[PDB]
Amino acid sequence: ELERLKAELDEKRQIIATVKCKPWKMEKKIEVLKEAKKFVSENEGGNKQTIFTEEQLDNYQDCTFFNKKDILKLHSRFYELAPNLVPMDYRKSPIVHVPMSLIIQMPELRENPFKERIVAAFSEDGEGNLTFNDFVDMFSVLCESAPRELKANYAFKIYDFNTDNFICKEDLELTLARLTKSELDEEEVVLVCDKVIEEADLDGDGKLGFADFEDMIAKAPDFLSTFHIRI
Amino acid sequence: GSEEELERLKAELDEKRQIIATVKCKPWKMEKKIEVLKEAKKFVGKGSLVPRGSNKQTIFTEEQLDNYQDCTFFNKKDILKLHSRFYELAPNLVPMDYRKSPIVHVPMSLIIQMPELRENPFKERIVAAFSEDGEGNLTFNDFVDMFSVLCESAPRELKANYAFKIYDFNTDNFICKEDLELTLARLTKSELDEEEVVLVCDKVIEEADLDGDGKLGFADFEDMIAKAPDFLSTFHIRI
Ligand SMILES: [Mg+2]
Ligand SMILES: [Mg+2]
Ligand SMILES: [Mg+2]
Ligand SMILES: [Mg+2]
């Protein structure tokens, strides 16, 4: 049975190490991390600051692709967006929402043609009124250390303009038009969209599910270029 | 490396199993025993969604019955029996449903009237010993702890833990000749004179006391119990 505890311990470790790769909200990632870390502890027997506790910085490091210094930079960047809403002491996990208009004005998102949709996808309500946790989530997914599949999950939601849980040719037309605003003519986008959708739609509905969309991203990788942003 | 790791896991597993098996032997309150047990127990049907193995009572949950069994020397039928005994003592106060863990205290005066305690010369002190306040107003948890300590399956050391306190009339964390004189006079139920009690107690303390103060600590009291086990006849009660 020692083998069974040793296997479960290893599974927990895998969970601990890959929660940052999950298309999940910060609070879900932290809850799963804590549970896995508890199993492990019960069976195995950088410059002071006052914005975050060390626990919450550790949790942020474990649930994102960022270091503790990065988190404190992101805090300053969020504060700058709304200095009269954003608290300077997060130690008691205060909940504050900054409006989408303010977030999208940031230099990192200003020029992105899917900025509003990127921001909304990291909100539970779909309105883009982000907390700090949502803001960290967004830039963790958008960073260069994040896996392609994480970006693809968000990309699938962000490019689903008709909100049907599918990527059709109408969805892809609006997407590629924004991605090629001065590259492809309203009439060449149609052709390219058709070709992609058809080589990827195996069930004959003209609509892509997540798995088919993933395959369509492996080929045509430039659909994920929107989701490479450095903060 | 791994040899070390596997060894570290084996030891943690074995310690957890030992803790689970011996919480019932501990002079602890029920709530503490259940907490330690819970922390240690973690880790350690084909054509039906019904588990094959086969709610005959509405007084306790099965989880409560499991905890009682693991934290005492009683089985589940014994626990249901103890409840009916507790109820009989105060039928208008004791709940018939304990599933939502209600907190109810029965007065000492009512508990010491039990046939199993009435003739015990230390009945008040025994009941008080299983109360957090020292007044003997017992919950069912306290009543179960008391009878688990007094049952025949309970080890000598657990009984001795409580005896050390109950015979400490002067509450100094020691057993002296004065404590023992009061104890032996009660234990002898007037079979001995005052003078005889003094003489027996003097010799007993002198033979067990190893530090010269004429007062026994737990260790010296344990030895004294071993040589004279009738001091522990008070703590053998069957329900
Ligand atoms: Mg769609
Ligand atoms: Mg399809
Ligand atoms: Mg004393
Ligand atoms: Mg002494």
Side-chain angles (χ1 to χ4, degrees), chain A residues 160 162 164 166-167 171:
Chain A
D160 190 11
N162 56 18
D164 59 356
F166 285 97
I167 298 295
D171 283 335

Side-chain angles (χ1 to χ4, degrees), chain A residues 1-2 5-6 8-9 13 39 42-45, chain B residues 5-6 9-10 12-13 16-17 39 42-43:
Chain A
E1 132 201 26
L2 253 183
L5 177 71
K6 213 274 135 324
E8 190 137 295
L9 280 168
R13 292 180 197 115
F39 181 94
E42 303 174 315
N43 286 297
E44 274 184 356
Chain B
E5 179 192 10
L6 289 163
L9 296 173
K10 191 62 180 179
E12 196 51 48
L13 258 185
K16 283 180 155 67
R17 305 208 181 250
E39 270 287 289
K42 288 169 160 289
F43 183 81

Side-chain angles (χ1 to χ4, degrees), chain B residues 1-7 9-237 239:
Chain B
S2 63
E3 292 177 351
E4 162 274 300
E5 179 192 10
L6 289 163
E7 284 162 1
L9 296 173
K10 191 62 180 179
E12 196 51 48
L13 258 185
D14 287 320
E15 183 192 69
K16 283 180 155 67
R17 305 208 181 250
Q18 206 68 230
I19 284 154
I20 285 151
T22 61
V23 277
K24 62 180 68 198
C25 304
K26 290 302 192 317
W28 298 344
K29 313 281 309 172
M30 189 65 68
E31 64 200 301
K32 165 164 184 193
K33 290 183 299 182
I34 291 173
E35 292 171 4
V36 171
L37 169 84
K38 281 188 72 179
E39 270 287 289
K41 262 200 162 187
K42 288 169 160 289
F43 183 81
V44 177
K46 284 186 157 130
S48 193
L49 305 176
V50 178
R52 293 182 183 174
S54 178
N55 289 337
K56 304 143 275 287
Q57 58 80 18
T58 60
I59 311 174
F60 294 107
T61 71
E62 265 285 315
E63 181 188 302
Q64 283 178 323
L65 285 176
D66 288 316
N67 292 355
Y68 279 137
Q69 182 166 240
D70 292 351
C71 296
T72 68
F73 297 101
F74 290 133
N75 62 48
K76 294 172 180 165
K77 315 277 177 54
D78 291 343
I79 297 298
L80 293 165
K81 170 194 60 187
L82 289 162
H83 178 267
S84 99
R85 295 306 299 282
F86 192 68
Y87 186 77
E88 204 202 320
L89 304 170
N92 192 31
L93 194 62
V94 175
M96 281 297 306
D97 179 6
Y98 264 91
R99 296 177 304 184
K100 293 281 196 177
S101 274
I103 307 172
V104 169
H105 303 267
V106 170
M108 167 189 286
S109 83
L110 298 184
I111 307 170
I112 63 173
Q113 289 174 241
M114 286 184 76
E116 295 85 357
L117 306 172
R118 284 182 301 197
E119 316 179 54
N120 194 294
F122 297 92
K123 55 185 167 184
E124 286 174 64
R125 297 179 67 68
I126 294 164
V127 169
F130 288 88
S131 66
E132 288 198 8
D133 63 1
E135 298 294 306
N137 310 308
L138 298 196
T139 65
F140 176 71
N141 281 353
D142 299 339
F143 177 87
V144 171
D145 289 323
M146 179 171 75
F147 278 104
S148 185
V149 171
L150 302 164
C151 85
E152 319 311 297
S153 301
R156 181 189 288 232
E157 188 171 357
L158 177 54
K159 297 174 182 289
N161 266 280
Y162 283 98
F164 185 69
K165 299 177 184 173
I166 284 159
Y167 292 166
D168 193 8
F169 284 88
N170 63 7
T171 322
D172 62 355
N173 306 305
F174 290 94
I175 298 298
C176 63
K177 293 168 186 181
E178 298 201 359
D179 292 332
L180 201 66
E181 283 164 20
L182 296 157
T183 292
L184 181 71
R186 282 157 170 235
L187 270 163
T188 52
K189 297 206 194 82
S190 286
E191 280 140 47
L192 284 189
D193 184 1
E194 200 150 58
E195 253 189 353
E196 309 184 63
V197 166
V198 168
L199 181 143
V200 180
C201 291
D202 184 72
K203 185 173 295 293
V204 161
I205 302 289
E206 300 249 296
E207 254 87 283
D209 189 44
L210 301 182
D211 58 352
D213 55 349
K215 293 193 171 64
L216 307 175
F218 188 50
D220 287 3
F221 167 84
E222 278 194 299
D223 294 347
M224 187 260 289
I225 285 187
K227 321 285 185 300
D230 227 73
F231 278 115
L232 267 206
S233 72
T234 310
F235 300 88
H236 284 87
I237 304 169
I239 197 170

